[PDB]
Design a protein around this ligand. Structure first.
Ligand SMILES: NC(=O)c1ccc[n+]([C@@H]2O[C@H](COP(=O)([O-])OP(=O)(O)OC[C@H]3O[C@@H](n4cnc5c(N)ncnc54)[C@H](OP(=O)(O)O)[C@@H]3O)[C@@H](O)[C@H]2O)c1
Ligand SMILES: CCc1nc(N)nc(N)c1OCCCOc1ccccc1C[C@@H](CF)C(=O)O
Length: 186
């Protein structure tokens, strides 16, 4: 089981969601970036694992659940079984990560990607050990009802570049944004 990663897109006012959807209009290449980063496995024969909260799961259109080419795991304390289309369900991020050591997953999983929402990011960013945060900074304010927790700059370093990730300003639909990568290893 490989690295532990968070990936998020966040507006200038720290918003990540609004009424069960994204706060901004669809950004095709931000979506393509999300898909490629979470799907690409460095190891032949393995897939990455995506971990998400219950509301993030149901925010994906039904025709696109589960996220293709990745092993999907949902966090919830209320659901008694994985929702339809999913095969894994844990009560906490800690439980989910311990689950990746069991035989059914240990040999199938390469990278682990936390893909939201807010309380999943929060549990991960406080998780001890080696963590990377792939953060898209959308350079506008958008009305939001769900937010990304602030990064503790006493623990994380901002990398100037990351392999395979463009470091310059992007723009689609009139909206500028930038791909950032933070790292810690405590
Ligand atoms: N911009 C982005 O990068 C991005 C990413 C993801 C989602 N989104 C947006 O954000 C919204 C969804 O995120 P959200 O924060 O509202 O909800 P969420 O985190 O996806 O779902 C919340 C629920 O998931 C479970 N949960 C979450 N964190 C948990 C944890 N650490 N341990 C155990 N269970 C946990 C709980 O379910 P139970 O009550 O059943 O226990 C909780 O009520 C949508 O608007 C979506 O479009 C945006
Ligand atoms: C692209 C946003 C994003 N960007 C970064 N960088 N990190 C993230 N975690 C992230 O959320 C991914 C959440 C999964 O959403 C989907 C995956 C497949 C099909 C459709 C959706 C839902 C629509 C709108 F709800 C969407 O979200 O594109």
């Amino acid at each position: 089981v490989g690295s532990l990663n968070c990936i998020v897109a966040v507006s200038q006012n720290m918003g990540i969601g609004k009424n069960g959807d994204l706060p901004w209009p669809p950004l095709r290449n931000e979506f393509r970036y999300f898909q490629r980063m979470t799907t690409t496995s460095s190891v032949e024969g393995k897939q990455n694992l995506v971990i998400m909260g219950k509301k993030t799961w149901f925010s994906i259109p039904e025709k696109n659940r589960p996220l293709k080419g990745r092993i999907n795991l949902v966090l919830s304390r209320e659901l008694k079984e994985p929702p339809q289309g999913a095969h894994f369900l844990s009560r906490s991020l800690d439980d989910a990560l311990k689950l990746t050591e069991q035989p059914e997953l240990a040999n199938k999983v390469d990278m682990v990607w936390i893909v939201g929402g807010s309380s999943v990011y929060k549990e991960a960013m406080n998780h001890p050990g080696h963590l990377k945060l792939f953060v898209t900074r959308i350079m506008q304010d958008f009305e939001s009802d769900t937010f990304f927790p602030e990064i503790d700059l006493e623990k994380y370093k901002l990398l100037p570049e990351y392999p395979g990730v463009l470091s310059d300003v992007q723009e689609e639909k009139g909206i500028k944004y930038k791909f950032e990568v933070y790292e810690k290893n405590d």
